[PDB]
């Protein structure tokens, strides 16, 4: 009874929240890990194919974003009150190690610095520069809104992600637009339902 209308009637939308950190993946280079949706007790760690949409998996980790850092990759997460720590593999959410005494190490996730390296924006327009011999290949007109450049990969699978409006993300590749995502719907508080629907006697006999 299900297989006819398995996916036809079900209506599921995936919301990842406003992205806080985008970490590249050492293997399968067109893949990233997104830390998003902070709160007082947990955050949402997801994996994301960057040349498409197609969220791969999501997990609600019970650590704040500032407690989640790389190794010295392996994504060490360390509580601060106690020293309960968990090392989780990238590219598969395997609990590589668990412990209570000491964390192995951490490195602070670096800031972008995408200016002075690869980007210059002057005439309401975005130019991608080589580091040296700045011939300014792959220029693109800016969108209407523009906040920042979330992610940028310069090697062969070129991918670029722009945080265009406050909650919208646009993804380009070598530049043509490839995908577009919106997380305006991250938390629904209340609802209301709107319905849509259609729209002497002898003279009656004759008509």
């Amino acid at each position, epitope marked *: 009874v299900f297989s006819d209308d398995a996916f036809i009637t079900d209506w599921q939308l995936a919301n990842l929240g406003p992205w806080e950190k985008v970490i590249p993946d050492s293997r399968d280079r067109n893949r990233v890990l997104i830390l998003s949706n*902070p709160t007082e007790t947990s955050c949402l760690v997801s994996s994301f194919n960057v040349s498409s949409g197609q969220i791969l998996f999501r997990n609600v980790l019970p650590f704040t974003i*500032d407690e989640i850092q790389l190794d010295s990759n392996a994504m060490v997460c360390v509580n601060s009150s106690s020293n309960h720590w968990q090392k989780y593999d990238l590219h598969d959410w395997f609990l590589l190690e668990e412990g209570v005494d000491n964390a192995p190490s951490t490195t602070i996730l670096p800031q972008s*610095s995408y200016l002075n390296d690869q980007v210059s924006i*002057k005439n309401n327009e975005l130019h991608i520069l080589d580091e040296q011999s700045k011939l300014a290949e792959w220029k693109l007109e800016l969108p209407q809104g523009f906040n920042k450049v979330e992610y940028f990969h310069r090697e062969d699978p070129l991918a670029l992600v722009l945080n265009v409006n406050d*909650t919208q993300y646009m993804g380009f590749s070598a530049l043509i637009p490839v995908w577009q995502r919106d997380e305006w719907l991250t938390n629904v508080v209340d609802y209301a339902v709107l319905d849509v629907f259609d729209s002497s006697l002898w003279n009656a006999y004759w008509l």
Partner: antibody
Amino acid sequence: AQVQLQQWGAGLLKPSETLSLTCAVYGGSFSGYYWSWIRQPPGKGLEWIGEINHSGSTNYNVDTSKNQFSLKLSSDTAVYYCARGLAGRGYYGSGSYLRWGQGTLVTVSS
Amino acid sequence: DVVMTQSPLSLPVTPGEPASISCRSSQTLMNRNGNNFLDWYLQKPGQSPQLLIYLGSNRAPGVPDRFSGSGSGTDFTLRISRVEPEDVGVYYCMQALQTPSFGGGTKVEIRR
């Protein structure tokens, strides 16, 4: 204009004590911008940079709470504004302050 | 350190005609890539300031098409193609290379 900043603080201060102000953010992406304080003293001027980062990288001419999204300042009479700036460079910030705060008034009187 | 000078301290202009404000700096604001790091601000009376032009030549979101910017190095210029009585308030420069200053205070005064 959904990401807008709300302020708390104090109105009356005698000379020589510290001035506590607190912004609070109501939008996305607390990490990716430099959040700065600016003064306007009456007398037709503005000058400050009190920059901050999500990983605390204070750049004076500004305490941070990543738990609740509220930077905090503790230091003359003026109006004090929050800000939010582009973060192109690594540890410096790049100005371009959009989404200012509503602004609090601080009078240092006897 | 860096000092910003705005040429006209008061510029009354009738609505309809172009207007321009100039801005000069001691040091150079020319980044290696080609980013200029100069912003132009407008403060309406009794209001928080607004952003008009945000990386020396761009235009901020939610701003009319009337405003434009130009310049490089040590000189910069804001230009309004058509002035309207909404465009009243104080106009400020800012440099973002090192420790922004807010040197300025132009005072467009359209009641001549």
